[PDB]
Every structure is written in C-alpha cells, then in structure tokens.
Symmetry: D3
Subunit: 304 residues, 6 copies
Amino acid sequence: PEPQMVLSPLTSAAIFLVVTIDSGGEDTVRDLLSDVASLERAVGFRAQPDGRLSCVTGIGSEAWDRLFSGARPAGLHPFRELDGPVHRAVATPGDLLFHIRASRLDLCFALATEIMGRLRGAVTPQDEVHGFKYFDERDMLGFVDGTENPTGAAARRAVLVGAEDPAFAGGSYAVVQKYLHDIDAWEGLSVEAQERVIGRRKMTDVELSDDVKPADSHVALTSVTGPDGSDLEILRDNMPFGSVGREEFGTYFIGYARTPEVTETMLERMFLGTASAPHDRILDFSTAVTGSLFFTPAADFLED
Amino acid sequence: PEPQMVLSPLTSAAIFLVVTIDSGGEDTVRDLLSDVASLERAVGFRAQPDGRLSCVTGIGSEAWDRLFSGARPAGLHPFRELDGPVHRAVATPGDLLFHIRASRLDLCFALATEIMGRLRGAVTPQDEVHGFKYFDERDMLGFVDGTENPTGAAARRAVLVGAEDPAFAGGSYAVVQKYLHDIDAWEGLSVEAQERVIGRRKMTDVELSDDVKPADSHVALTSVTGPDGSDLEILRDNMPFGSVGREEFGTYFIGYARTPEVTETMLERMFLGTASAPHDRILDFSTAVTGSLFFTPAADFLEDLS
Amino acid sequence: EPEPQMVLSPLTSAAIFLVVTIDSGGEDTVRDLLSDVASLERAVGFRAQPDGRLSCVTGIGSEAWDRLFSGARPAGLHPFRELDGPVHRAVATPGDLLFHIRASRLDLCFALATEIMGRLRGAVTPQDEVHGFKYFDERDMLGFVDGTENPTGAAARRAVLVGAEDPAFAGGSYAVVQKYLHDIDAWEGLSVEAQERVIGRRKMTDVELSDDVKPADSHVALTSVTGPDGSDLEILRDNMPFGSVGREEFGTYFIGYARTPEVTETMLERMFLGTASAPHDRILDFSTAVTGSLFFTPAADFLEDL
Amino acid sequence: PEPQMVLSPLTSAAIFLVVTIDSGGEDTVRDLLSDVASLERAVGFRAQPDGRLSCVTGIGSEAWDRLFSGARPAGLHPFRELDGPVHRAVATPGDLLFHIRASRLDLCFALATEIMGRLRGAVTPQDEVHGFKYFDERDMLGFVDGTENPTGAAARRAVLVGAEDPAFAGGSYAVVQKYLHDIDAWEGLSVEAQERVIGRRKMTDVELSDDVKPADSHVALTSVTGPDGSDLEILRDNMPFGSVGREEFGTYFIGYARTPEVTETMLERMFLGTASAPHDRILDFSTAVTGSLFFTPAADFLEDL
Amino acid sequence: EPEPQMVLSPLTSAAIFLVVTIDSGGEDTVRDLLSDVASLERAVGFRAQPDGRLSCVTGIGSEAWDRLFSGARPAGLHPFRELDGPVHRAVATPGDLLFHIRASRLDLCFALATEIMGRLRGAVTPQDEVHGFKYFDERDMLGFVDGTENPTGAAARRAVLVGAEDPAFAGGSYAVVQKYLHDIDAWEGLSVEAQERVIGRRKMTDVELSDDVKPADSHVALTSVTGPDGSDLEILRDNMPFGSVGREEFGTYFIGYARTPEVTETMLERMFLGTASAPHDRILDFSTAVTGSLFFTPAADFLEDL
Amino acid sequence: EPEPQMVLSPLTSAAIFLVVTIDSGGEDTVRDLLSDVASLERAVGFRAQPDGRLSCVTGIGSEAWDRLFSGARPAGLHPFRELDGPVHRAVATPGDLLFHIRASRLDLCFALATEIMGRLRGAVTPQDEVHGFKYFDERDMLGFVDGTENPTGAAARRAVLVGAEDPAFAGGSYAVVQKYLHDIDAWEGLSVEAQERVIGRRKMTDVELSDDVKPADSHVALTSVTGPDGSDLEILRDNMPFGSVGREEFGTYFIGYARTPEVTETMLERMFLGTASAPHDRILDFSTAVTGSLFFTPAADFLEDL
Ligand code: HEM
Ligand code: HEM
Ligand code: HEM
Ligand code: HEM
Ligand code: HEM
C-alpha cells in the first residue's frame, strides 16, 4: 500500500482546513476524494523541486459511516473530551481534515482554493489556520519544536497502520488541537522557570537531566513506554499561527500515530495528571479551543 | 537624507498594520517612532542575509497634527473619497501604517509583535493583512503584478521627495486600499476577455498592441503623461491575501509617489473615468473596502524624535 | 540485484540528445566506449556535485545489438515501426546508439558529450544532435506544463524497469524517441480554451479537464491506456524544448521509457491511427515527427562487464 | 541618461543574434526598437530574481543612416578588416545585434522568439549563437575567462560614452567576432606551453610574472597603456559555443568600450603584431569567421523612437 | 532491522575529527555519553535542518572495546598494524574513541564537539583534533579531484556495512584514519604531466589515464584491487583538507570505511610495501603519515541500548 | 577619487586573520607583495563569483610604516596603547602587517592566504593566525548576537574612512585587533538574566535593555559614546568566533575599524579603566585579551602605485 504523505520533508508553511459535510453533500465529497491526489500534482508540479507541496486528507468517525459501507478502521472513534480538575480538552465538530504543507504559503493557498472550489455547497468550514514556522524551528513559546520526532524506520513503525488491521494498512490517525497561549504570563517567567515547564534548555535544546527534570514538565508527561520497555512515539508537526491586533498567539498541534491509543494516553497524562504530577505545566500557559480525531487512509483507498 | 526602505528588493511576504491613536496615547507613539529602526535591526540582523526584513512607517494627516508641532509636508491631506456613477473609493480611518516585508512571514510577525507590544493601550487596530506573493509574481486574478514598476534612478526620481519640499526630502507618500475580488464573475470570462480588462496578455505578460488595447483597460487608464509628455510613475507592491473558508480573495494595493497628486490622478481616472472610458473595468470585479494616505518620513526624521 | 542506469533522474533543465549509427568495422571501438561510459559520467560530473546532476543513459538499437553482442536478445527489442495513418505518419529513421544526457547546466552536458564523441571518432556517423532546455515553470514549446502525470517512486520502478519477465535483462528499459517540429503560428492562433481542448488540461493551472468535457481526441484522453486487468499502463517522459529562432524551428524532443515497448506503441497507435471515437490526436494537427527510433537501455552492470 | 544593461552581473547563458535589414524593413525595425525594453521586462519580470535576463541592442554604421536622421555617433564606422602576414580578421554583414544574457538559456530563447517574431519579413539572419559558460568560469580552451575585466566605476569609465560625444552619452561600442578552435592542436601542448600562450596559470589563474610572460602571450598583447601611462580597458563577456557532431568548438568574443579605438588597437596588436611579437599566439589555435562593429545607444534613445 | 550510523552521509563541506584516549576510571562516564550521543546530535542539528546535514559517527578502538564491554567482540577488530616499508612507514598512534562530525557548516560541527567533550571532561585525554574544509570543486591539497571513484547506492552499502557474516554486529563498519602532511614545495616542482603519472588521472578534467599509459606505481593502480572471484574490492573515503599557512602545514585527513579492515589493509600493504612491479605508491614521496588508528563504528541501536 | 580597500564588505561567514612581523631586510619583498595583493584577490576569487565574496584588507603598523616608507605619515598612526587597569589589562603585542581575509567559505580565504605567504616566505615571521567561523545566527561564543548596532550605508562610510582631516591619506582607515579568550565555565554559571545585565541586551531576541534597567557597567553602556556636538561616535566591527575543543579554548577575535583611533581608544579606556559610574566593563570578567595591535589600512590606489 502507498501511504499519503504523512512522512513529509520539513515545511515552513501550512494550511489546516477542518470542515463538516452538509446533508446531501456525500457524493460531491466522494468525487473530490478520488481526485485529491491529482489536484496535488496539478498545483505542485510546476513549482518543484523547491515547493514541497503535499496534502494529507482525514475522515472523522461519524463522517465515515455516512460515506462508506463495509469495514471500519479498528481505532476510529470521535475525539474523547477530557475534563480534568483544572484544565479541559474540548471536543469540537469536524468531518474532514486537509493538512496542506509546502515551503511557501501561496502553494498551500492555491491547493486549498481548488479543493474548497470543488466542495462549495457540500460542506461548512469549521476551522481555517495558516501556519508559519519561525526560521529556527521555534514555536510561539520560543522553544525548538519537533526535535524528538522519530525518523526513517522508527517513523514508519510509529505512524503507519500494518498487519494488525490489514484492510487499512498504510493509513494513520491524526489528532488536532488548536491552542492559544498566554504570552504575557509566560514572558514573566525566568528562562530557567520556562525550562522547568518544557523539560529542555531554551537556547541549546538539550534535554534536562533526569535528576533535575520535573515530574510535571511537558517532556516528562509525554514520555510513555510500552510493555516491552520500548518508547511509544508519535509524529508531530506543530505550527505557530496568530494575529497581532487581536492578541492571538497560538500553536496548532497535530499528532500522527498508528493507533489513537498512544496519543490518547499522552493527553490523559497532560490533562488529568498522574500520582506524581497534577497536570502538564504547559497547560498553565496554553488553552485548547478545538479537538478532533481523523483517519488518514492509504492513497490507494482514496483512488478507488 | 537617508530614506526608509521604500525601494526594497523583491519580497514574498508582508504584514500591513493600520492603527488609530487613542486619546492620550501620543507620547507613547513618539517614543515608539524613535525606536522603530532599532527594533527592525534587532529582529532582522540575526536572520541576514536571506531574511530581507524591512519596516516602512507612515503617518496620516490628522495624526501628524497631534504628534508634531511645526511644519507639515506640503502634500499631506486626508484620503479623498471618490464617488463615481458606478464605483466608489472609500476613506477609512488610519493614523499609523506599518508596512512590514521580508522573505518569510514569521520575520514580519516577530517585528509586528514587538511594535504592537510597545503600543498596547495607546492605539486601536483598524486593519491587519497577512500577504503572500505567488511564485511567478502573479496576483489573485492570474496576471503578473509589478512588471512596469520603475527601477534604479527612475524609481528614486518617482518616489522620493526632493527640492520641492526640502525639510521633508527623503520622504514619500503611500496610498493603501484593500480590494476584494469577485472571483466567480472573473473566471466566467474567457482568457481573451480578461486580457481586454487588464491590457496585457495573461500567460506571457506582453502588452497588447495599441491597435487592440481598449481605452477602459487597466493599463490604459493608469498610464498618464505630464505636461512635457514624460510618463508619470508610481511604485507599487501589491500583495494577495485571503481566506478560503469565507471566500475572501483580495489584493492589498500600496502605491508610493513623490507627491500624492500622481496617485490621486490615476484613482480619478479609474473611478470617475475619461472622455472615452466610463471607468476602469478592473473595478467591475474589484471592490475597495479601505482607503488611506500616509506620509513616510526620512529615517533620520524618526530617529531625531521624542 | 542489477543496477539500472539513471533512467529515473531528478528534474533537469538541460539535456543533450545524441543519436549515431555505427560505421562498418567500428564494432570494437564502440564496445570499449560502452565499458567506460559510466566512468566518464563520474569524471565529468563528480566535481560539479551536488548541483550539477549530470547523468547519461545509453541505448542500443535492434540491428546494432546483433552486430555487437552474441547470445541472448532483449525480448521487446525490434526496429521502430512506421505508422502510416490516413492523415499523420510516424516515420522510422536510422539510429544504432542513443546518449541521453541530462544536467542542471548545458555546459556539463556538452563536456560529457565531447568526451564520448572523442572516443568514437571515425567509428560512428552522427544522425541527430539536439540541445534541449526546459522553461522555468516546467512548460514546453506549446506553453503547457509538461511532465505532471509521470509516475514517481515505486510505480515509476514497476512501469519502467524490466524484471522477471526477461531475467537476463532485468534492470533495463526501452526508450522511444521522436523529434517533433511545431507550427507555432497555427498554435498561437487558437484561443486558450481551444488549446485546453487539444491537450486535455487547463493551461494556467494545469488541472485536468473533467471527464464530461474532455474531448475524445485530446492528447491526454488518447494516451490514457488501461490493460487487460484494468491497470493504467504508464510511461516515464522527459520531453525537452529545442529550436533556432533564425530558421523558425520550434520543437519538442519526445523521449519515453517503458518496461516493454508495447505500452508506448499502443499510445502511438492511438495517436496516429485513431480509435472508434477519435480520428487522431489533435496535438498532431500542430506537430510533425521528423525522426523516430527504438532503443534498449541495458542495466549499468551489463555495460561494465563488457 | 540611462544606459542599457551593458554592465551586467555574471550570466551563464547567452544568445547572440545578428541580422541585416531587408529593403523596406526600416519602419518595422524602428517600431521594434521602441519596444525592446518593454519586451525584456515582459519575459523577465516573472522569473526574477534568479533569471537575470537582459538584452543589449546594437546598430551598425550603414543601418544608422537608413534608420535615423541627424547626428551620428562620432566613433561609428564599419568593422575594419586586418589582413596580417599569417592571420586575418574578417569583416562580415550585420545591421543589428541582439546580445541576450540570462541564468538559463530558455529565458534567452523566449526573448529572442518575441524579438524575431516582430521582425519577421523585415530582416535576414546572419548569425545565431547559443552560448554556455562552464561552471567554473572557464572558456573552451580550459582557462578562467573574465578575471581582469574592470568593475564598478572603473568599468563605467571604460565602457560608457560621456562628455566627448554628449548627444550620445550613456551608450557604448561593441565589437563581435566568432572564433573556431582547433582543439586537437591545443590539447597537444602541455599545460606549461598553454600557460605561455595565455599569460596566466591554468589551474590557479595567477598572472605569470613580467620576466616570464612571453611577449607574444595573449595577456601581453592585449595589455595597452594610454599616452599618460594609464591602462586602456575593455569589458568582455566571451562565451563558449559548439556542436559535437560537426566538431565545432567556439569562442564568441564580444567587447564593449567607450570608443572603438581601444578595441581596434588591441586587435591590431593581435593580428599584425609589434616589434617583439609576430602575432598573438592564441590565433595559432583560433580562427575568426565573423567580425562586426555596433553602437549600443542609451536606453532612453530607443524608448523615444 | 539494525539501523546503521550515518556512515553513508550526503556530501558535506565541513568536518571535525576528534580522537581521544580514555583515562583510568573514565569507563562509566564514556558509556553514559555513548548512550546519549544520538540525542545530542538531534539537539544541536534539528533546528538547522534541512540544510545543516549534521551527523556524528562514533568509533571504538580494539583495546578500548574490552575495557568498555563484556561479551563478544566484532570479528575484525584489532589495533592498527604498523607497516615498516623500505622507504615509507605507516605509523600506529593511540586512539580509543573517534568522533567523525560532518555538516554543511563548521559551526554545527563545533557546537556538537563542544557538547560531547563537555560531558567527557575528566574521563578522556585528546590525542588529535582536525578541522576539515572542502575546496569548492572537491579538490585536495594536491589539486586533484578527491572522491570520484567512491561507490554509491547499493554498491556502497555492500562495500561498507557488516552483514550476515558477523550477525551480532550487523549494521557496523570499520574505519581507518591517517593524518597526512604534504611536501607542497616538492609537488609544485613537478610538471602537471608528472603529477598525473603519480595519481593516474588527468588533473584538470579528472579523466582516468588509459591502462597502457597509467604507471604501475600510480596511486590509482595500487589502490585498485580485485578479489579471488575477480570482482573489485571497494572502500568509501571522505578525505578532508586541513592546514595552517603560518606553520606551512598542508594536509589530507584520510578516512576510509569498509565492511572488513582486510580490504583497507590490503590497499595499505600495496601502497607502503609495494608489489613485484611497483616499489611503493608514488603519492607517498610527497605525503607523510603522522597518525594511524583503526576503529569499529557500531550500529546506532547498539549505542542507544547501552 | 581614492578607492578604499574593502573595509565595508558584505556579510561573510568565514575569515582568516594573519598577523606577521617583517624580518630585518624583508622590506623590499614586502613592498612588491603589497603592490600585487589586489591582483591576487582577483585571481583567487574570480572563478568563485558571485557567491564567494572574497576580499583582503591589508594593514600596516606604525613601526613598519617608518621602515617601508619615507615622507608624511597618517596623523593617527602610533603603536597600540597598553592599558593598565586596577583589575584588567589590555596588552600590546608585536605586529607589522595585518591581512584580514573574508569570504563565504574558508577555502577561498585559505587559498588567498597561501598565495600571500608564499610570496613573503623568508621576509616575515608569523605572530598570529586565526581561522574564524560565524554561527548560523550571527552569535558569538557567549551566546549573544554580535554586530547588530554596526553602522550601515552612508553612516558607515562617514565613521570608518579618513577624509579632509588628513587629506594625503583619504580613503584609509585604522584597524584595532585584539584576540580574546573566554572563561566559559564561569559565564555558564550565570543565569540568562544575569548574562543580559553584563551585555546590555536580551539574549534570545537581541532587543536593547530599557534605559531604566540597563546597568552602568554593561557592555553596551560603556561602548556607547557621544561627541561634544551630541553626535554618536561609531566604529565598524566584524568580530569572529574561533576555538579548539580539545584545548578548551573558546574565543572572540575582535576587529574594529574607524576613521581615527581616538574613537576606538575612548571605548577601550571606558572598558578597561572605567568611568565615574562603572569600575570596568563586566564583559572583561569573562574575557581576557591576549593580543593587541593597531594598523593603518591605506586606500587601494596607495598600494597599487608602489
Ligand atoms: C499545547 C501546545 C504544545 C506545544 C507548544 C508543545 C511544544 C513541545 C516542545 C517544545 C517539545 C520539545 C521538543 C520536541 O521534542 O519537539 C515537545 C515535545 C513533545 N510534545 Fe509537545 N507541545 C504541545 C502539545 C503537545 C501535545 C498536546 C502532545 C501530545 C498529545 C505533545 C506531545 C509531545 C511529545 C511526545 C514530545 C516529545 C517528548 C520526548 O522527548 O519524547 N505536545 N512539545
Ligand atoms: C484593484 C486591484 C489592482 C490590481 C489587481 C491591479 C493589477 C495590475 C496589473 C496586473 C497590472 C499590470 C502589470 C504591471 O504591474 O505593470 C497593473 C498595472 C498598473 N497598475 Fe494596477 N491593479 C490594481 C489597482 C491599481 C490602483 C488602485 C492603481 C493606482 C492608483 C494602480 C496602478 C497601476 C499602474 C500605474 C500600472 C502600470 C501601468 C503601466 O504604466 O503600464 N493599480 N495593475
Ligand atoms: C508532440 C509531442 C508532445 C508534446 C508537446 C506533449 C505534451 C504533453 C503534455 C502537455 C501533457 C500533459 C501534462 C503531462 O502529464 O505531462 C502530456 C501528457 C502525456 N503525453 Fe504527451 N506530449 C507529446 C508527445 C507525446 C507522445 C509521442 C506520447 C506517447 C507515445 C506522449 C504521451 C503522453 C502521456 C502518456 C501523457 C500522460 C497522459 C495522462 O495519463 O494524464 N506524448 N504530454
Ligand atoms: C580568441 C578568442 C579569445 C579567447 C579564448 C580569449 C581568452 C582570454 C583569456 C583566458 C584571458 C585571461 C583572463 C581574463 O579574462 O582576464 C583573456 C584576457 C583578455 N583578453 Fe582575451 N580572448 C580572446 C580574444 C580576445 C580578443 C579578440 C580581445 C580583444 C580585441 C581580447 C582581449 C582580452 C583582454 C583585454 C584581456 C585582459 C588582459 C589583461 O589586462 O590582463 N581577447 N582572454
Ligand atoms: C595522501 C593521502 C591521500 C590522497 C591525497 C589521496 C588522493 C586520491 C585521489 C586524488 C584519487 C583519485 C580520484 C578518486 O578519489 O577516485 C584517489 C583515489 C583513491 N584512493 Fe586515495 N588518497 C590518499 C590516501 C589513500 C589511502 C591511504 C588509501 C587506502 C588505504 C586510498 C585509497 C584510494 C582508492 C581506493 C582510490 C580509488 C581508486 C580507484 O578504484 O579508482 N587513498 N585518492
């Protein structure tokens, strides 16, 4: 099976598009699905090799049942709301996801325009986010973001559905959350206090040693080990976004995994806490305003 | 006089911020204006040479009177509304303009944050546009945008105030209009009909012959000669922007000129028309939703403030 | 496993195409050259890496094969077959060797060409030399993006490289070449929308026409072939513009690689002889083939152990 | 006044077009001259900043009188043939020169196509050369080519007409010659011998010292000093060209100068020699097959036609 | 199933070679650093991707291996063997750990070397530190192109990575380093033609000399070796220039990877001790070895699992 | 109009600083080299244009000048003035010629340095050789951005080039060099906020500390100087990192250019001796000067005319 481009080269721009399907809009949706790879080539080819344009297309749980009969991927369910003692992970509507990435925003915008043009009258936009990475891979909190992502074989093992669900091999599961930051509060901390919240040094990006790293630091709470003592990993491509005039400074989280159970265990640790950690300290400066879960099929599924 | 970076090398991203100055906010703005060049260096230096970050700061006519006590640039006035039979050019509020450009959008955003941090509580935002150039210099209508801009000595002569206003030599005047387009109407026309709207061929950007170029084309109406028969010129750096979800597809227009009279004359011809042309046909697919005029002083003028 | 030649190459903006016949008694000099071509490619290109992106793919003709080697023949190796259609004809012309040379810069291509021809002087006669350049936005001489639908990755490998079906020649491929001359005057007299109907795609945006409007005699519809099982039969193209302004020669050099010549020959038959629903490919109304040959490009290790 | 792009940044591709004007062709040519700066911006603007497309247009002595009335540039005359004891600098026909330069040949070709599309039926082609520099600024003989070109204000002084001819300030004079090389004879020398021909080291491009540099080396003959002992300089943008099947290996010479007499003095020294040199030894491996002289007017001159 | 280290790196223009010995009692501090070195690679390099191309290959010497680890040793690991030739000698010099650090820029190499050596203060003693730089056209200090005949792709894998023959260390390699200093005065006293006869390729164009003119004592003749079956034996080199103008030190840092040190050893034996037809490699009359050490570079999983 | 040397260079990522003394009887050989160095720059640089940006600025010391030249001398040319503070000391060390060689890559620098030294062998003795490298974000070894408030354009020319105040030497400049080593262990035990109070700017964002919080003994405070007429007295710096990881040597090579050494001297006096409000520059609590030399860099034509 040929996968969609979940395993993309690094990109500096992105458009995230989340829509719901209107009643009656199912067949227009299906026709787009069968053409989305053709559109990707059409927009991207003339801008190569620097463009790096790709599109990953996801389908939510409730949408799947409307669109397709027969077998359902084994881990597809709606996003699970988490109501912690202090912080909460909200669940918000979404039926399709377009994750569009490139080296420049104009290529993302071009592709989005063609997709949205084909769907007009068949869907309702829920969220549109134009992301940009800082030139040194830093996020809105000023920390490098992406450093521990798996690469090569480890990435394929972590991200791609295999023989555990054969009919859907080559697919993946995407979780999105739009965060908005309290920048005023964050900038009132010392750099050393920010370090203790994330778990790594700010300027040099070196992990804090195990003797100094807090139990409630981000890196601590999202480090998860499986039965066999192996690291359970996800692949993230978080993107900064914002608006200077409305004081909107955000991180657009997106995490890919082979099963949602990994990502969901991480979110439970962050929002609900553990015996040794009340919650992820990053959430004292970060509020989630969306939350959705999708299955991103194999490319050959969409073609048929 | 050292100008601000009006004559920038080509850039693929911009932010345009327009703000009004609240009652009492004047001292806070003066302090910021004296620091703006220092912030552009702080944000941009460590990204050289590929970052190409620059900020041009512009001040409106009403703001000028509140901020500065002495002489006024000769050409500085409120943007003049134009009510034609069909199309209107609106005047909207704007005291200060920050026109931020770079090779990437994050550098523009960093500078925009530092500026707005210094101005919080003293200004109200009126407009914020994130722009992005297409990879072949095309605008939202599919046409190459910028080809006939002046270059080198010719552009310096068209854009920068000189002897005519010598206390303000080294400044320029900028006109800003945000235009939204009707893209479904546009794409219903045949390529050849689009070529009659603009005045140039779509794929190869070659100007149409004088034998075929309609009088109400955009290229006809915006070409002006002076008394002596020499061409009057402006420098533009129009930027696409928009939102696919809301079907907003736009051009942010910005023109710089040594005097407003040249840009005003062009606007007059587009909206009000001529003996042979009712109006610029590009306006049958473009609506103006903002309209403001700004003087962009010499860089030393800003440094020497309090 | 056999090592292919660089049939599957990264994009290149320049090429040279060299087609020669082997003179009587020149067999031995050609064999020696074959054994060193890969070493010449390295010697010219290695110091210009990684931006140079120099490669050469060598092919051999049906009659030449039997002159050079003894033992087995590749299964699909045969002379280019002439196509005499009611209107358009595909000519067969002589050619014993093909050098298909690619790089980011024409001077690298010329340097390698110089070395190869240096070694073959007096043993071969030139038939065709074309120096190709692609336009900055992947357009061809007709002003359409060209190469959009080529296969990539693993599908490219399955479509082009010989496998188990002919195990002695696994890792090889078949090249068909055709030099075409365009009537650019006729072409440039069509509207864009009518050009879109000849090719089967949008010109500016390169989006394929939908199935309810795509003509049966467009290029894309005729070169779209399904097999027995209903698999799309695919080829890999690297078409290159060429020409001379002074002699009015505006051309497309066609080259297509395929695991078996049958696929390329079925497309040619549909172009030239037509189907029940299409008399011929409308592209031929603006395009005339002046050369035509068929070559086998063996695995690189076959040429080495020569 | 605004000069044409004579002073170009380095480009790796070029197209040289030389044509003659047919009977009744003048009107069509004048209309194109008025348009060629607009055409350059039309082809080039959308491929900026990497494209570096420029067109310099040149007019020959005979053509000037057919196209324009009134003043002539003071230095404009037909190319002067030089019949040396061994080597000959030939004169051939040309009314108009288009010198087209870019980072890639497709851009050069697109411009050329539009210019010639406008001139079709008015003009006859004399020469068309597509040129390519090697990736390390080397020419067909294997040497670095362009090292001692002047730069900056020194180039401007050497190349652009000024006060001496104020009606034509901002323009320049271009001499073109196409050279074919005998590569097999060149590759027969050792490197040391080739260095003696040129006047510089082959790999490092360091000039041979005055005591070792032969009097008949290329660098020695083309190094001229004025009355006051100042150096007379030209700007060159030589380009390799060829065809492997016909065994054609070429340099296209093009030199610009504020007066033709500098370039002509250098040609004299090369083909006729001096007291201590019979001729330029580069000529023992290089044969001139065209020669023409052109004036390249200020760009405003053409725009105003 | 094993993941190798980055032995097969893309081309890099900067390097740092660090060789250290492990002090008495430093074993535990070393093992902890070995388990983190891949993490430190990401820490330094991630934020400069994708153009940074930062990597670190870590190797371990024979004596060191027994001090650090209990259980099996890699089959070919032993100390560098000194070669005492009639004229030329290849010395063995102490070395327990190699860090071969490559990137597109020297700052990334230096930052990573800083972090590694910071963790190892107190536990190791430096023996050598070289800062390598590319000449821009892949030349070495002798002015010849250096790298041309290196294997690529599949051939490279097979030549470099330990396989089924030593399954516990699959994904490993063996590295041989020698720092050479050149007599540049002597070399530049040669004609280019004489320099060509030393190396066995043309200087300017890098084309290999024909088999009937290439001397038997030429560098290329003596490092060309065939196996029992007749097949070539290959190694992967990434030789780097280094130097100090004031002290007249002009050098080549030789580094050569192979799946077994027998291949590299056979090349060295042929260079230093000669054959029946060649006394020694002529390159050594202008090149003196001042270090020599052998290391095993384990699979990446081996280190992390520590 | 006298042509300056390339004091005002574009940004470069690599440098070699070469400081020599002239041996007894070497004057003639140095005079000949000085007259050819601009030719050597062209020869080495040209074939790497346009990315190479290779330049060499040649400096002559006070004692050397008197040895090489007769007649008038630059008005400001003296040996470096040793500074003996209560705590910290600026040393003076020998140096007759400075070569400041810059480029986008180290190989160009090294090849030019090799041509220069080759011509001078026998005539001069080396005193210092430093190979610098920039960090990808313009940072120094203390972790701060380094060069931000350097003058640019017309301001830079006015600051660095000699003019009508010494017209026989118009187009020259003065260069002061000091090699600094940093105690990084001591620096790294400060908090980020504490490091920011030493320098005078924020570490991550490079924004100037406000006038209400900037310490009197911070770097930026002490090196900000105003003239009688209220004008800012500016120098042009191109400080470069260097080091050796094995030796734990981590350095900044300081070089500053100005039209009179009185400007550079005033800033050194404030650092090492202090003011009324500050004992010394706190940056010297982590930085030790180990060289100190002053040179005059004549106009280009001065050097050619020899
Ligand atoms: C709320 C906004 C978020 C921000 C700004 C943020 C930023 C960071 C940064 C700076 C790191 C360390 C560098 C790196 O390895 O990338 C990190 C690590 C990580 N975060 Fe986040 N992150 C956010 C949310 C999330 C969420 C919601 C999840 C998971 C569901 C997640 C999972 C991870 C994981 C697994 C790692 C790597 C831990 C390791 O070293 O193994 N993060 N993130
Ligand atoms: C409404 C959105 C606008 C769009 C999409 C737009 C687009 C264009 C395009 C495509 C061209 C041709 C290529 C070139 O740039 O030279 C152009 C030319 C021009 N436009 Fe606009 N334009 C707009 C508004 C205006 C306005 C409001 C003015 C003046 C106030 C203006 C002044 C000009 C000028 C002066 C020219 C060059 C004409 C020439 O001298 O050949 N534009 N415009
Ligand atoms: C006059 C010569 C030619 C020109 C200028 C030309 C141009 C084009 C263009 C513009 C496309 C559409 C974009 C693309 O997918 O690359 C196309 C597609 C194609 N052409 Fe041609 N072509 C020519 C000759 C040939 C010939 C001789 C063949 C085959 C024997 C060929 C086979 C194809 C195929 C198979 C495709 C892809 C169809 C699809 O699956 O979408 N073409 N070519
Ligand atoms: C015949 C084909 C020609 C070739 C292959 C050629 C090649 C070269 C080369 C390699 C150099 C040395 C590097 C440099 O550019 O500075 C050079 C220098 C020069 N060439 Fe040519 N040249 C040719 C014809 C001519 C002609 C016809 C002229 C003038 C009429 C000329 C004038 C010069 C000048 C003035 C220099 C610079 C000398 C100096 O001041 O050092 N060349 N040529
Ligand atoms: C003084 C140190 C060295 C210098 C400057 C040097 C330089 C060269 C050069 C210029 C080439 C020809 C182009 C190419 O890389 O293929 C060459 C080839 C080669 N060198 Fe070295 N080398 C050195 C040491 C070594 C040593 C110590 C060995 C082996 C232990 C070695 C093995 C090779 C091999 C195998 C080739 C490939 C030959 C072939 O198959 O064509 N070299 N080297």
